[PDB]
Design a binder for this molecule. Sequence first.
Ligand code: 3PE
Ligand code: LMT
Ligand code: I49
Ligand code: SF4
Ligand code: SF4
Ligand code: SF4
Lengths: 311, 45, 176, 72, 145, 156, 104
Amino acid sequence: MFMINILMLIIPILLAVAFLTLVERKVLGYMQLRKGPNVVGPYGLLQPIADAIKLFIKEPLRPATSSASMFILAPIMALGLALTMWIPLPMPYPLINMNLGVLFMLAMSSLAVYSILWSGWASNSKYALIGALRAVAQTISYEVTLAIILLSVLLMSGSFTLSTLITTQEQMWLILPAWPLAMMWFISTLAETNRAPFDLTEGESELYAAGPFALFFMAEYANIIMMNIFTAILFLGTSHNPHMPELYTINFTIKSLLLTMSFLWIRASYPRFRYDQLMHLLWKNFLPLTLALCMWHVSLPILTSGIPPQT
Amino acid sequence: SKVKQDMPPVGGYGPIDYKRNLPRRGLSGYSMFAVGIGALLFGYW
Amino acid sequence: TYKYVNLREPSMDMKSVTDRAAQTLLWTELIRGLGMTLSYLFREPATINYPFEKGPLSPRFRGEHALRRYPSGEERCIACKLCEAVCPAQAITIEAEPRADGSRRTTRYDIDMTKCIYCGFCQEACPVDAIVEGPNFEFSTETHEELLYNKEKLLNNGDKWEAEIAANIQADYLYR
Amino acid sequence: NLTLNFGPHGVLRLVMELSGEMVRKCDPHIGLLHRGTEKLIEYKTYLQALPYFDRLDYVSMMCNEQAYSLAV
Amino acid sequence: MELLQVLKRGLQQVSGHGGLRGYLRVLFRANDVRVGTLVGEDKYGNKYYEDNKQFFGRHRWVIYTTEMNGKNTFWDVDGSMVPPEWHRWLHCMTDDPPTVKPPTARKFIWTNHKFNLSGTPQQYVPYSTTRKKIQEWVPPSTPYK
Amino acid sequence: SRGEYVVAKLDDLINWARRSSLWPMTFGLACCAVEMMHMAAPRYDMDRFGVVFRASPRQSDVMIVAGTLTNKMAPALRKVYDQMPEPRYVVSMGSCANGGGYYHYSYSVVRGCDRIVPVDIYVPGCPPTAEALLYGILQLQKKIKREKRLRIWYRR
Amino acid sequence: MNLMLALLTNFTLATLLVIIAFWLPQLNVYSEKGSARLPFSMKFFLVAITFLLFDLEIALLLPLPWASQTANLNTMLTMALFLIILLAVSLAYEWTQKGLEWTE
Ligand SMILES: CCCCCCCCCCCCCCCCCC(=O)OC[C@H](COP(=O)(O)OCCN)OC(=O)CCCCCCCCCCCCCCCCC
Ligand SMILES: CCCCCCCCCCCCO[C@@H]1O[C@H](CO)[C@@H](O[C@H]2O[C@H](CO)[C@@H](O)[C@H](O)[C@H]2O)[C@H](O)[C@H]1O
Ligand SMILES: N=C(N)NC(=N)NCCc1ccc(I)c(Cl)c1
Ligand code: SF4
Ligand code: SF4
Ligand code: SF4
C-alpha cells in the first residue's frame, strides 16, 4: 500500500514536468503576441508526448567520455535526487513525515551540485569543465542565502518539520511578517535553478542529447516545480481542514501553479545578468541583508514574546 | 480624364505622435516604505 | 538641430533620494516591466493559421516564373533575348530558330531557379509580356534538378496560372 | 592568457585572449560571407548591379539602393 | 457578465459547425473552430470563408477538401491545393472572389489544377529541349576496301 | 498479418513524433536568415507547429542553410552537420544555398550547399518569403510522414 | 523502512530511465560513423572556499530555533548575534580586501 503511494507521487511528478514544457511555451508565446504549440493535439496537448518520444528514439550521441561511470552517474544523481525532494512535502500529508524535513530538503538539495560537477568531468573537454565550475560557483553561492533565509523563517515556526509551517500560518501567511525574506528567497530560487535572468549556463555556452538530455531536463523542471511548492508552503501557507484534506490540496496546488507561472513570466520580461553581476547581487546585496534580517528574526520573537512552541 | 495617383487627402493627414510617453505611476518612496513597514508590523503583531 | 538623449541631473533632495532607494529595494521598475508582459498575455495574438490562412500580397508580387500566350494560344515570346540580356544572374538561356511556319520562336528557354534572384527585371524587359513572375510562392522541391526549368515547364506554368496572372497584370499595368 | 578560437547579421569567428574574466585581445576573423560582390559588379551594367546593393546591409535595402542611385 | 456571453459564443461554434462531430472535425483538421460566412466552393471541394470582424490576415480562410486529384487530403493538406482563381482572393491580391469576378476563360488554361508534385512519379524532370547540333557521317553498309 | 500491422502502426507513431517535434539548427548566413526570423515572429509562429525557435546543434533534427555558403565557411558548416545526431535533415533555403544564386560565378562561393551536405528540401526564392519557408518545413514534415524505416527493417 | 523504500525507488527508477535512454533499437547495420592546473582563476577557488567557511557558520546557526526555547535567553541572544556579527565581519573583510571582485 505504501509502494502504491510512492508511484502515485513519482508518475504525476513526471507528467506535470512534461506538461510544464507545454505551458511554458504557450505562456511565453502569448506574452510574445503569438500562440505557441497548438497543432500537435488540440491546443498542443500532445506536444509533450511527441517531444518525449522524439528525444528517446534519437541517436544517443555521447562522445568517448573520460569517465564512463561519471557519465552515467550524473543523470541518475540529478533525477534521483529531484524526486527525493518531494517525499517530505505535506500536501497536506507527506509521504514521509520527517521531524527534520526542512533540514532534509536542504541537505539533499546541496547534493544536486554533484551532477553538475560530474557531468563536467565526464564531458572530456576543458571548456565544458570550466562551464560546469562556473555553474557550481553560482549554485553554492546562492545556497548561502537560501539556508539563512530558511533559518530566519523557522524562528517564527519553531521547528524543522514541514507540516508545522502549515500550523504557523493558520491565521496569516508568513509573507506578511517576512516579505523582505520572501523577496530574496524567490530570487534565490531562480538563481538556484539557473532560471533566467540567471540562466548563464545556457547563455554563456551560446556565446547532451536524446534520452540523457531529456533526463537532465526532467530533473531541472521537477526542481523548478518543487521549489515553487516549497515557496508556497514557506510563505503562502494553506489552511488544512483534517476532514476535507482535498480542499487544502486544491488551494495549495493553485498557489504552486501560479508561482511556477511567475517563473515563466519573469523569463519573458528581463535581460540576462552578467556572471560577475549575479555574483555581486548575492555577495554584496542579498547576503548583507539576509544576515541583518537573520539577526532581526532571532531578536524579534524574543523581544515581542512571540517564541513559537517546539512541538 | 484627370490624373489619379496616390496623394495625401486634401488638408493632409492627422497629427502623428512620436515623442516618448512613459507616464508616471505609483506612490512616492515614503508611502511605499510606509506600506511595507505597516505590513511588517501587522505581521509581527 | 539636436537633442540630448541622456543628460539630466537627478534631484538630490530627500524625497527624490528616497524615491530611488524605494526603487532599488522594492524593484518598482522591474515590477512595471512585469506589467507590460502581463498586458500582452491578454492581447489577441497576431498569428495567422497557415496554410488555412495566408499572408496578404499585392498584384506586383514576384514569385514563380511562367511563359504566357496570346488569347489565340500562340506564344507571346518571340525570342528577342532582352530578358536573357538583362538578367542580373545570367539565369536565362535561350535558343531560337524559324518555326516550321516561319515564326520567330524559341527552341530553348531555361531559367535556373537556383541562380535566379527573383528580381523581376526579365518581365520589365520583355516587350510582349511573355515572361512574367507569377503569384505562386509554394513550389519547394525535394531535389536540386527540379528547380532547373526548361521551356515545357515554364509553358505549363503559364497554362496553369494564366487565370491569376492575367488578373494581376490587369491590376498593375497602368503603373507600368 | 587563455585563448578562445570562437566566442560570439551573419557569422563571425572571434579569436579572443582572456585573463580570467577580462578580454585582453579581440581579433575578429571575417570573410565568412565574402562573395566578391565588388568584382561581380564589374561584369554588370549599371542597372544589373543595382540588386547587389540590396544584399549588402540586407536590413537597410532601400537605403543601400539610394546611395548607389545617387552616385550614378 | 460577459463571461456568460463568451461561453455562449463558444457553444454556438459547436452548432455552427453542425454538431459535435463537425466541430471536432474542423478542430483536428484545421486547429480552428471559428465560424465564418461561406464565400464559395471550388470544383475540388475546398471551401472559402470570410469574417471581416477578424483582423486583417485572419479574415479569409480555406477549409481544404478531403480529396483532390485522387489523393487523400483529410490530414495532408497543402497550400498548393488552392486553384489560381481563388489564390488571388485568398492572398488578398483582390477584394472580389471568383464567384463575383470570374476569371477570363481561355482554351489553353488548365481545367484541372495540380498541387505540388515534387517527390512523386509526376515530378518534373529537366532536360534539353534542343535537337542534336552535329550530324555524324554514317559509313556505307556495304564493303569496299 | 498482425506483425506487418504492428510495424505499420509503429512507423506511424515514430514518424508522427519526429515530424511533430522538428528542432532546427539555423545557419543564418545572410539575408535569408531575416525571413527565417520572420517565420519565428508572431505572424507565422513556427513554434506553434512544434518547431522550437533555436535549438542547439546537438539537440537538432533539421539544419536550415539560410544564406550564401562561401568557401571559407564550407568546412565549418560540414562540421556542424557531422555533429548532428540522427535522424538529421537539411533544408536549403534561398537561391544562394540552393545553387549559388546571384553569386554563382564568384571565386569565393560554393555553388550550392548540396556540394557539402545532402539536402532534403530546396526552398526557392531570393529570399523565399517566410510563408514560403514555412511551406518548405511543412513539406519536410510530409516527407518524414512517408518514411517506412520499420517496414524496411523487418523485410531485411 | 519507508524512507529506504522511497529512496530505493527514486534512484532505481532514475537508473532504469537512464539505461533504457541509452539502449534502444537503432535499425542500422553498418559500422558507426590530464591532471594539471586547469586555466581557471584563483577567484573561483576563493568563492568555493568562501562558501565552505560560510556554510560551516550556517551549521552553527541551525540550532537557533531550538535554542530560543531556553530559559537562559540573555546568553542565547547574545551568542546568536555574536556569531552572525562575526559572519558579517568576515564578509566585510573579504569585501574591503577586494575578495569579491571579478576584475583582474
Ligand atoms: C520595524 C523593523 C523592521 C526591520 C526590517 C525592515 C525591512 C524592510 C525594508 C528593507 C526592504 C528589503 C528589500 C529586500 C529585497 C532585496 C533588495 C535588494 O537587494 O535590491 C537590490 C538589488 C541590487 O540593486 P542594484 O540596483 O543592482 O544596486 C545595488 C548595488 N549598488 O536589486 C535586486 O535584487 C533586483 C532583483 C533582480 C531579479 C529580477 C527578477 C525578479 C523581479 C520580479 C520579482 C517579483 C517580486 C518577488 C516576490 C516573491 C513572492 C514570493
Ligand atoms: C518513449 C517510448 C517510444 C517507443 C517507440 C519504439 C520505436 C522503436 C523503433 C526506433 C526507431 C529508431 O529509428 C532510428 O533511430 C536511430 C537513432 O539513433 C537513427 O540513427 C541510426 O541510423 C543511422 C543510419 O540510418 C546511423 O547513422 C546512426 O548512427 C544510427 O544511430 C536511425 O536513422 C533511425 O532509423
Ligand atoms: N523550454 C521549453 N519549455 N521548451 C522546450 N525546449 N522543451 C523541451 C522539450 C521536452 C524535453 C523533455 C521532455 I520529458 C519533454 Cl516531454 C519535452
Ligand atoms: S527574376 Fe531577375 S534573376 Fe530571375 S530570371 Fe528574371 S531577370 Fe533573371
Ligand atoms: S520572354 Fe520576352 S524578353 Fe524574353 S526572349 Fe521572349 S519575348 Fe524576348
Ligand atoms: S538567396 Fe537572396 S536573400 Fe538569400 S542570402 Fe542569397 S542573396 Fe540573400
